[PDB]
Design a protein around this ligand. Structure first.
Ligand code: N8X
Ligand code: N8X
Lengths: 304, 304
């Protein structure tokens, strides 16, 4: 028992991190097979970032201008191309440590682990959620760009995120591995509105089930609710509307605990309307939304 | 910017995990050089665990009874010995993936990453603190025993913890890598009092400095305090007494932010006496004590 904000073991991803330098900018790259993927802003100086013409900036660069180092060994760049906001640097050597992998575009509300890196070296790993507004609340300093987000299903790493920037508000924006930004964000140093964010209702409910499984039960009540009634409360408190698809995904947790999803919704309703009253759930004094129903099942069953 | 409960990259430790089976019990082992380290209770059946005579149980076991598998390959056991609560299984092959390592005994209040494993396979990684009462609040199910805690300084892994058991209260107990339990705990299925726990004051102050660095400043006030006055408040709220050694370790964070340690203590005093008033600090609605001053400096500077 016990429930923690657990990240995936990062080893398979650590073996893919490289340092990419172009001119005076250094950031991280992801080496999979004979291709290194990195944010295209590696070709910019901070001066260019105000309004960069990436096509023009990339034309002034040749394969020999992209310095790729994997630990202490230099990779020979034999091709370069821009795909959306990522550069793909073809190298003459396939990464011997390339794990089985996929590139996936996750949905808002889904979770993933981030391996924060600097100069191609791993600094740490943490679990986070893609917010409903397509930002992430990470921990990224200058040089962290190119650090990636991922999930792991047994031996296959699904890469879902590459870090590109910090918004003026301190939240983080990035792309899938085809270079497409999550959200309306552009790789330009400009005012960028992240939309209104909401709490991931299905995740909070999943976390309440994890709390019951692990012994924290004080919030369970004698009430029930309907999806319509619950959604009027979810609206007031800036929670995502709960759908039958969300109830269906909570099925296994409802079956394991014997607590009907709408009964757990009534507990969540009372917690929203009355607060925690100075009490905690799984060591938290707020309603946690960074665990999906899949994460709860995985952690509660010990999937490796 | 941003501040997360970051774990160390687990790759170097993942390469050391093996599965150890003895009779009908399977748990995790740590393979470093030609030695596999695992909890000695691998030789017990649940029946033995009520009051085990480990010396007698181990005498009935031979090298061929310890089945050690590293992924899918079998290791040949050529020696076995018990050191405190750990078994050391000498194998005929040195782990090719053995990183530079040390065995260290951490102090209460210090933090480390745990690589949770099942059947010798990694499931996830999370950061936690050794509580002042020498327990840890982890996430461990049946089969997680032998999972280890560690810190990493550049290329050297300092192993500090090996998981052994869950107390009847749901908190976790384990040993250093020489098999010595942290705390008064015994590897026996019996009633075991974990002492009174307290909040790690120096860590909360370190986390308040991290909050100021990352923009969360609402808690800063016009007050100061003394170590004596602060400790009267720390006593009332079950916080560890702050010492000059703790103030000295907070030195770098005080210098970086320009906020005197006793001024930050006055903010902490007001937060203890008045609460958060429904506000948050770094995404938390409680005072976080699982970040040491070293962790804050490391994360705020991007150490790899
Ligand atoms: C001027 C400029 C403009 C853009 C669009 C991107 C960057 C990189 C960046 O913000 N990186 C970073 N990652 N975490 C925190 N920070 C500061 C820089
Ligand atoms: C009966 C008995 C007695 C002892 C002293 C140890 C064990 C292993 C154990 O408790 N392992 C475990 N690790 N996380 C959660 N749990 C249940 C079993």
């Amino acid at each position: 028992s016990g429930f923690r904000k657990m990240a995936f073991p990062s080893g398979k991803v650590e073996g893919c991190m490289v340092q990419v330098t172009c001119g005076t900018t250094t950031l991280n790259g992801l080496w999979l097979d004979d291709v290194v993927y990195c944010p295209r802003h590696v070709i910019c100086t901070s001066e260019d970032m105000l309004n960069p013409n990436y096509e023009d900036l990339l034309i002034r660069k040749s394969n020999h201008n992209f310095l790729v180092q994997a630990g202490n060994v230099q990779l020979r760049v034999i091709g370069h191309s821009m795909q959306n906001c990522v550069l793909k640097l073809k190298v003459d050597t396939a990464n011997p440590k390339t794990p089985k992998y996929k590139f996936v575009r996750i949905q808002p509300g889904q979770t993933f682990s981030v391996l924060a890196c600097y100069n191609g070296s791993p600094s740490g790993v943490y679990q986070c959620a893609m917010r409903p507004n397509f930002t992430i609340k990470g921990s990224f300093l200058n040089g962290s760009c190119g650090s990636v987000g991922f999930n792991i299903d047994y031996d296959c790493v699904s890469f879902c995120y590459m870090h590109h920037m910090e918004l003026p508000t301190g939240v983080h924006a990035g792309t899938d591995l085809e270079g497409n930004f999550y959200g309306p964000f552009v790789d330009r140093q400009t005012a960028q509105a992240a939309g209104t964010d909401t709490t991931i209702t299905v995740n909070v409910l999943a976390w309440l089930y994890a709390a019951v499984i692990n012994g924290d039960r004080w919030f369970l009540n004698r009430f029930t609710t309907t999806l319509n009634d619950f959604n009027l409360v979810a609206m007031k408190y800036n929670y995502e509307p709960l759908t039958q698809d969300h109830v269906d995904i909570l099925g296994p947790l409802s079956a394991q605990t014997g607590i009907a999803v709408l009964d757990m919704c009534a507990s969540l309703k009372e917690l929203l309307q009355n607060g925690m009253n100075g009490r905690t759930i799984l060591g938290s004094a707020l309603l946690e939304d960074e665990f999906t129903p899949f994460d709860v099942v995985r952690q509660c069953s010990g999937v490796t």
